[PDB]
Amino acid sequence: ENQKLIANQFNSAIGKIQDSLSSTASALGKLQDVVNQNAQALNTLVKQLSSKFGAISSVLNDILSRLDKVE
């Protein structure tokens, strides 16, 4: 009798732990997707910022150069 009890409660525990492991796997997968997406976002931001500051610098030197031409 207590063998049916031990078996049934062990099966219940293993089912609950299966559910918990599937939930942990789904959570880690979502976290991985979002962390990688934010990493790609930060990387494309640093790249586009490099380009934008390059353009800013360029127009700046054009300004200074044609100013020196004025002076």
Binding site: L5, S23, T24
Partner: protein, 42 residues
Amino acid sequence: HTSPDVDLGDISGINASVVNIQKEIDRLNEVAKNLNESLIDL
């Protein structure tokens, strides 16, 4: 003269997502609490 309008533009298409794993954390805590209904009491 008549220098063109040098528009730098905007940082378009850059945006960070958001994790929503509250369901999974709730499931984990619910299982950690429900495992007390799986202890063996001979």
